[PDB]
Design a binder for this molecule. Structure first.
Ligand SMILES: [Mg+2]
Ligand SMILES: [Zn+2]
Ligand SMILES: [Zn+2]
Ligand SMILES: [Zn+2]
Ligand SMILES: [Zn+2]
Lengths: 169, 45, 51, 66, 1161, 51, 57
RNA sequence: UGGGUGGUGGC
């Protein structure tokens, strides 16, 4: 469809840069920032970019062009995917593979199944249980400290001022 | 000022945050602090 | 070992270090003439439970 | 480790009867008969001395810490 | 002599477990390593050669300057701590453990550098191999328990494990597949390939994988018309036909290939399946054309002509195929006759004259301990050393410098490698991080003593977890006495993890060459005189994977050799094993065979010992003297001929009775005893072996259990996998040791249901629990399903009250040559980001004085770094945990490996066993303390005895653990008669003896006493069963798993709250929780959960191009969709921050999610 | 002052199990209602020991 | 595992820090007492309170 | 108030 998917748009001339919330620097040991692998990969892309524009501005032996262009294509390939068949992976400075964008989305612990469809949340609690038949059927025992930690926002209304002021007290 | 108890010869020696930390008698480099001047308390149950 | 204790006055309800005493036997009707208890028994009630 | 004071089940003070128990053991007694002589008749004050195994000798095997 | 009773076998066990102790398997093979392995790994490839020979823009100076280094003797010593001062002194394992050290020795090596003049640098510390505890080459093998208390080593310690960067690490015996055995597996059906004959090669010296020849029968069941086979080779890319690779190894005609392979000219069925193989291999008719053919597929290079193509094919058939047999040539009979046995075998199995082979028949596996593992990793970084010296040589020969070699060894290579590769165990060079067998070495666990006793023995299995197959997880029935039928963890590990049994021993690795001499010492006939039509009935003999010859009568030979192991001409741990069925007879000498001992039954009708045990009572009196009547330990038993070893392969060819009362055929109908089978099939048996004791089939965490032979076996497995979590006494030197976990249980009692085996784990001298009073009676519903009742007054008397220890750590870093760190008390002014606790408890020198009560959330170790170039210091304090309380013990202060300071702190407190704390039976009947009752409110029997622990009636009748009742009864009797009754299983201890003794000491026969209400004394209508029993304390508590969370720490990356207990994270309201919320349907709750107690996040959209590009300034309150010049069609949303993350990730991959807020069609 | 082979609350625990004479005890009041802030010689039996 | 495996309740406050149950509810959650963990999410609004109190009770 | 790997244990 023309105003949405025009098939000269399936070839990237201009590969965008996300803002650095998506690759924010991590305090390695509280003075030095180890970077996120997107920052390392966009740096590698920009290095191969400048080593592209270095060849068409001087004497170029015609496959030095070809290899630096194919290396550019390689860096753009591993920016979105480090799982492509047949070829070796893009590798880090530990001996580990690189966290792509594809690895941030698939898998059990990606952003959807690990962060959007299900995630971690707050106002929870957790313990080990015990039976107690001296109880109704709709009652559950609460240890006191767990009652201290968690809370509930009750609205200050015109029918609950006194107790809530006491709960302040 | 602190009695740094020697690990070998039991010598109570204080160090002035400057001394290389060893036994003065045999070179044994392990010290420990000694107990405080306060009085500890317990409820004996 | 230099120790200093206080001694204060508590009951067994606070803790059982204030136990006054040790072990308390208790029985009534040793021949079960009320049939308050009921023996479990393989063969015969009189023989196996000693007096 | 080292002998406790009371029984765990009942609460008869027993801790004194450790040294006497070893001294009765030295003559060749048998352990039940030795508990018999010490007046230990419920098994509560029989397991509180019969089971007990001794480590604090091993702690005093450390030639001086200080 | 007389009857060998039970306690005579306990004489036997006392001799064994006074010779070896426990952890032989670490120590003795690590001794094998330090004595021989490094000497031969160095002298494997002893010389490098350079040459810069000619035309150096020369005057035709043709000069073989051949640079030749020859490696020599290793030098071995004590470990040594060279100080930052520079002084060297005797390090010791206490001084090691206190100081984060590496108990590591100088490993020196001299270098013989020579020069060829054929014209046409001293003891370098080459590395630090870390030394195991208690080894020969540790300094604590010898030297006087007295002085060991002067040197802080407990005598009831046993060692076995290593020390790295301070802490203790261990070696799991990793379990590799067996090498060099002639297997046949059958292949799954959706495939044209059905039968397989496979091998995995590895050199005899060195024990290292080289080749893997595979055979695949082309042909599914009536699919694949030509039922002929090809081979697959190493360094090829494609399958190659069988007769062609035969003609390639140097046997061309059809007649000689059928002479090598076929053993029966009347086996016309297999001969019939033979014929198409030859008829397919007709097109390649002699040797060198097949060599040229294999040159075409398998890496002989293109355009490299016939003579060097065929050279390369002769190299993959000289080296690189059948390498473990030999790597020299000339024995194509040895090679081809091995492969003719393969063709023989695979056609035997493809016509199903046999079962398939199976994966787990435990003789067909081996094991790798510290010996072979240090062999492999030492080989690796030793090759790396080789090329490092080579690299430096080609730089200081260009400029031609007389190099001293002492700046030519940067010996952080092998020390750094072994230190990382035991630090995390990601086994390999760190630049081979993945594709590597992960988790080799483990944190040793010191939670209690028996836990460590098992964990030093543990094996693990690398199938990975890919394949859910229940065939490798079966308790497959080679396991008699070799692993533990009880112990294996719950869950993911189950079926894999095999604890070496209480009669395990690890066979070292032995010179096979004298065994070869024993073979040819009796007229074994060589392989070149072999014609199977001349001799169809000779016996074909294996040595670890090489068939070496034939002979007619194995029986006289196995008599001689078996009696020479009964004497000692052989290593007495070499399994000489006979078969008669195959006309074959094997001798393994291989490393890592799991052997076990048996009582040698005199299996021979030659004298009156036949049927009887060879073990006399004179030997028993000798063991009770400690000497022979002109040293006599377990070694002389082994070299006496009373006990022979078998591994899993000789387990095939034996005949066992279980107990020595079953050797003589015995004499009824008593309803107490147990019923052995009759064994009336063979009227005249030849028993060759009888078990020493059956409770020696168990694992170490399995022999603890009182009467394992009266339970439902998942509860046996549970008890063995809970016995490791006991609180008790772990080693007797907890005063000086500083460890991050330690817990002492106060009042530890040896159990009244002791075994006879608990003498040999010392558990009666270091127990990990108590005897408390069992009373199995529903009282007030508090034990409904596995909870229990505990009398609070008994806890007040000290019941299971628990010591709690923990060691922390910190050290100084160096941020510049003049810029270092300093543990000081930081101010409120000069220092950045004070922790929100207080600082008052700190001292003048930054480390808190002992005796001081400490709470959580306040400092102990304030490491202040001044920020490299007021307000210029960084507060980087190391605090005590957010859960704990305590009073502090023993605050270590010293100097690091680095030369700067170092700290370690051992805080402690004591935890009251309270409501919710898990406990455990000795039969798994587990659960938590449900409720606490004070003293009077218990039920109480006629004398005054109250109980302390009340397991449930309903816990019993389905779990079917009748051993628990047997323990309670035997406990009460052995309490009253006052001694510890032998509850080692499989005796004639019935229930009847216990019943009669309880009655005849003045009680009820079946346990019960008439117990009462404590609230009335109105007698409990049913009589209540009631006694002592041994209890233990599992490591969990409720004070470590309570957690709740309002808000707090969110990650930077995704702004969803964090994961883990330690940072006070939040819980995963997971998928299937959302599923049940959908099932209830109240989705408004779901919009609470995934919006409002999480990453609630607010974005904007331009309503025309639909995107979130709209730049948001708010106090100036202006916006601009800069791709559109849109300034009005602007809305905001409420989406999860991770959904926004999805959108930014996608737009950075060029997909365009556009969010229009109206339905369009 | 302690320097033992035994820890501290350990010994306080074992001291809490120790049997005292309390024949005269009902003219000694309870701790939590005796008229002193922390211990005096109206309601304590102060043991100081240093073997 | 089924639509009862989340159920609403009411609050009873007890010392001695563990979770108390009735034992008739042991069957639907399938919990024994050898150390299970059971979570406790809390509503933060009035709306979700009534949602739970009328359906998931 | 780190990340990121990896190990063992609980239901
Ligand atoms: Mg369960
Ligand atoms: Zn000293
Ligand atoms: Zn007692
Ligand atoms: Zn727009
Ligand atoms: Zn007073």
């Amino acid at each position: 469809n023309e105003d949405y998917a025009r098939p000269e748009w399936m070839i990237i001339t201009v590969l965008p840069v996300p803002p650095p919330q998506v690759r924010p620097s991590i305090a390695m040991d509280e003075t030095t920032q180890g970077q996120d692998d997107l920052t390392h990969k966009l740096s590698d892309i920009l290095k191969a970019n400048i080593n592209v524009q270095k060849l068409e501005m001087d004497g170029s032996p015609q496959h030095i062009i070809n290899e630096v262009e194919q290396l550019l294509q390689f860096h753009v390939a591993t920016y979105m995917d480090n799982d492509i068949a047949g070829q070796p992976q893009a590798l880090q400075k530990s001996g580990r593979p690189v966290k792509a964008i594809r690895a941030r989305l698939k898998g059990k612990e990606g952003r959807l199944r690990g962060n959007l469809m299900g995630k971690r949340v707050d106002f929870s609690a957790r313990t080990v249980i015990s039976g107690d038949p001296n109880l109704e059927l709709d009652q559950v025992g609460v240890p006191i400290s767990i009652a201290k930690t968690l809370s509930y926002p009750e609205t200050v209304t015109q029918y609950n001022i006194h107790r809530l002021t006491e709960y302040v007290r | 000022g602190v009695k740094y108890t020697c690990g070998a010869c039991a010598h109570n020696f204080s160090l002035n945050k400057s001394d290389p930390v060893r036994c003065k008698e045999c070179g044994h480099r392990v010290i420990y602090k000694a107990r405080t001047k306060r009085m500890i308390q317990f409820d004996a149950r | 070992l230099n120790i200093r204790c206080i001694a204060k006055k508590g009951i067994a309800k606070e803790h059982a270090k204030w136990s006054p005493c040790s072990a308390i036997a208790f029985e009534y009707d040793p021949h079960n003439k009320l049939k308050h208890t009921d023996f479990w028994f393989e063969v015969d009630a009189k023989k196996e439970w000693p007096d | 480790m080292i002998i406790p004071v009371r029984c765990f089940s009942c609460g008869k003070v027993v801790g004194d009867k450790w040294d006497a128990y070893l001294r009765l053991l030295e003559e060749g007694k048998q352990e039940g008969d030795a508990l018999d002589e010490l007046k230990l008749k419920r098994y509560c004050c029989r397991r509180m001395v019969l089971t007990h195994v001794d480590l604090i000798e091993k702690f005093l095997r450390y030639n001086p810490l200080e | 002599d007389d009857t060998i009773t039970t306690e005579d076998c306990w004489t036997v066990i006392s001799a064994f477990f006074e010779e070896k102790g426990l952890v032989s398997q670490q120590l003795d093979s690590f001794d094998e390593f330090m004595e021989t392995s490094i000497q031969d790994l160095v002298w494997e490839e002893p010389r490098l050669i350079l040459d810069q020979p000619a035309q150096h823009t020369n005057e035709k100076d043709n000069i073989n300057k051949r640079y030749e280094i020859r490696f020599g003797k290793i030098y071995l010593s004590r470990p040594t701590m060279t100080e930052a001062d520079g002084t060297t002194h005797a390090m010791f394992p206490q001084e090691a453990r206190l100081r984060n050290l590496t108990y590591s020795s100088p490993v020196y090596l001299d270098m013989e550098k020579s020069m060829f003049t054929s014209i046409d640098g001293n003891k370098v510390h080459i590395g630090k191999v870390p030394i195991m505890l208690r080894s020969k080459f540790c300094s604590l093998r010898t030297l006087d328990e007295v002085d060991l208390y002067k040197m802080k080593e407990c005598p009831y310690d046993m060692g076995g494990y290593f020390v790295i960067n301070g802490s203790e690490k261990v070696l799991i015996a990793q379990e590799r597949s067996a090498a060099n055995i002639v297997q046949v597996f059958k292949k799954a059906a959706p495939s044209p390939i059905s039968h397989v004959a496979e091998i995995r090669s590895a050199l005899e010296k060195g024990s290292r994988l080289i080749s893997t020849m595979q055979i695949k029968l082309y042909g599914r069941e009536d699919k694949g018309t030509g039922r002929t086979i090809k081979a697959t080779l190493p360094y090829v890319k494609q399958d190659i036909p069988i007769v062609i690779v035969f003609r390639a190894l140097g046997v061309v005609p059809d007649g000689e290939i059928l002479q090598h392979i076929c053993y029966d000219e009347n086996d016309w069925q297999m001969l019939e399946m033979l014929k198409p193989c030859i008829e397919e291999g007709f097109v390649i008719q002699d040797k060198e054309v097949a060599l040229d053919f294999i040159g075409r597929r398998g890496s002989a290079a293109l355009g490299i002509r016939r003579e060097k193509r065929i050279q390369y094919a002769k190299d993959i058939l000289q080296k690189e195929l059948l390498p473990h047999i030999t790597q020299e040539e000339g024995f194509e009979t040895r090679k081809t006759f091995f492969l003719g046995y393969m063709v023989n075998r695979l056609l035997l199995c493809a016509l199903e004259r046999k079962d398939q082979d199976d994966r787990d028949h435990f003789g067909k596996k081996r094991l790798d301990l510290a010996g072979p593992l240090l062999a492999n990793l030492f080989r690796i970084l030793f090759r790396k050393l080789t090329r490092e010296i080579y690299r430096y040589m080609q730089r200081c020969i260009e400029t031609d410098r007389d190099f001293n070699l002492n700046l030519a060894v940067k010996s952080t290579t092998i020390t750094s490698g072994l230190k990382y590769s035991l630090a995390t165990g990601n086994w390999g060079e760190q630049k081979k991080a993945m594709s590597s067998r992960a988790g080799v070495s483990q944190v040793l666990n010191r939670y209690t003593y028996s836990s460590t006793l098992s964990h030093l023995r543990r094996t693990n299995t690398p199938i990975g977890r890919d394949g859910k197959l229940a065939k490798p997880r079966q308790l497959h029935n080679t396991h008699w006495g070799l692993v533990c039928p009880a112990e294996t963890p719950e869950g993911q590990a189950c079926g894999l993890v095999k604890n070496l049994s209480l009669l395990s021993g690890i066979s070292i690795g032995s010179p096979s060459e004298p065994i070869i001499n024993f073979l040819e010492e009796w007229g074994m006939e060589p392989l070149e005189d072999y014609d199977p039509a001349q001799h169809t009935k000779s016996t074909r003999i294996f040595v670890n994977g090489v068939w070496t010859g034939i002979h007619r009568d194995p029986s006289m030979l196995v008599s001689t050799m078996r009696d020479l192991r009964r004497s000692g001409a052989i290593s007495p741990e070499v399994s000489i094993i006979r078969d008669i069925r195959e006309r074959e007879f094997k001798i393994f000498t291989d490393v890592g065979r799991v052997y076990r001992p048996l009582f040698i039954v005199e299996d021979d009708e030659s004298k009156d010992n036949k049927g009887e045990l060879r073990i006399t009572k004179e030997h028993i009196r000798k063991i009770q003297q400690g000497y022979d009547d002109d040293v006599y330990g377990w070694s002389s038993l082994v070299t006496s001929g009373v006990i022979e070893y078998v591994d899993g392969e000789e387990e095939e060819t034996i005949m066992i009775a279980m107990t020595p009362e079953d050797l003589q055929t015995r004499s009824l109908n008593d309803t107490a005893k147990r019923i052995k089978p009759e064994m009336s099939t063979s009227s005249h048996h030849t028993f060759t072996h009888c078990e020493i004791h059956p409770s020696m089939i168990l694992g170490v965490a399995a022999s603890i259990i009182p009467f394992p032979d009266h339970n439902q076996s998942p509860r046996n497995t549970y008890q063995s996998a809970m016995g490791k979590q006991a609180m008790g006494v772990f080693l007797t030197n907890y005063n000086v040791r500083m460890d991050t976990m330690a817990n002492i249980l106060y009042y530890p009692q040896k159990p009244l249901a002791k075994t006879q085996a608990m003498e040999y784990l010392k558990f009666r001298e270091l127990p990990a629990g108590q005897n408390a009073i069992v009373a199995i009676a529903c009282y007030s519903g508090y034990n409904q399903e596995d909870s229990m009742i505990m009398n609070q007054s008994s806890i007040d008397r000290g019941l299971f009250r628990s010591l709690f220890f923990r060691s922390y750590m910190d050290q100084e870093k160096r941020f510049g040559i003049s810029i270092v760190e300093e543990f000081e008390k930081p101010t409120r002014a000069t220092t950045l980001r004070l922790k929100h606790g207080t600082y008052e408890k700190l001292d003048e020198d930054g480390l808190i004085a002992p005796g001081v009560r400490v709470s959580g959330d306040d400092i102990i170790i304030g490491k202040t770094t001044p920020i490299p170039p007021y307000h210029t210091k960084r507060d980087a304090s190391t605090p005590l945990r957010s859960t704990e309380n305590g009073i502090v013990d023993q605050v270590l202060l010293t100097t690091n490996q680095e030369g700067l300071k170092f700290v370690k702190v051992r805080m402690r407190t004591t935890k009251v066993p309270q409501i919710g704390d898990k406990f455990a039976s000795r039969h798994g009947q587990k659960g938590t303390i449900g409720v606490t009752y004070r003293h009077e409110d218990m039920p109480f029997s006629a004398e005054g005895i109250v109980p302390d622990l009340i397991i449930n009636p309903h816990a019993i009748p389905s779990r079917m653990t009748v051993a628990h009742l047997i323990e309670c009864l035997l406990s009460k009797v052995g309490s009253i008669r006052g001694y510890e009754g032998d509850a080692t299983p499989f005796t004639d201890l019935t229930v009847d003896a216990v019943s009669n003794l309880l009655r005849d000491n003045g009680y009820q026969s079946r346990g019960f006493e008439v117990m009462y209400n404590g609230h009335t004394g109105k007698k409990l209508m049913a009589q209540v069963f009631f006694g002592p029993t041994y209890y233990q304390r599992l490591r969990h508590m409720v004070d470590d798993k309570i957690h709740a969370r309002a808000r707090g720490p969110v990650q930077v990356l995704t702004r969803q709250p964090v994961e883990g207990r330690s940072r006070d994270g939040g819980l995963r309201f997971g998928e299937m929780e959302r599923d049940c919320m959908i099932a209830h349907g109240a989705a408004g709750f779901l919009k609470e959960r995934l919006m409002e107690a999480s990453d609630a996040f607010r974005v904007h959209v331009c309503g025309i191009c639909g995107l979130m590009s709209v730049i948001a300034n708010l106090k100036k309150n202006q916006f601009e969709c800069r791709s559109c010049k849109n300034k009005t069609n602007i809305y905001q949303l409420h989406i999860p921050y991770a959904a926004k993350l999805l959108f930014q990730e996608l737009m950075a991959m060029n997909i365009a999610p556009r969010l229009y807020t109206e339905r369009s069609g | 002052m302690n320097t033992s082979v035994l820890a501290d609350e350990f010994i306080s625990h074992r001291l809490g199990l120790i049997p005292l004479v309390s024949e005269d005890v009902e003219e000694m009041k309870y701790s939590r209602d005796c008229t002193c802030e922390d211990y005096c010689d109206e309601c304590s039996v102060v043991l100081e020991l240093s073997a | 595992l089924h639509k009862m495996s989340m159920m609403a309740h009411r609050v009873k406050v007890m010392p001695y820090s563990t979770f108390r149950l009735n034992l008739s509810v042991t069957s639907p959650y399938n919990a024994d007492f050898d150390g299970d963990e059971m979570n406790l999410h809390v509503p933060q609004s009035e709306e979700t309170r009534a949602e739970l109190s009328q359906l998931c009770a």
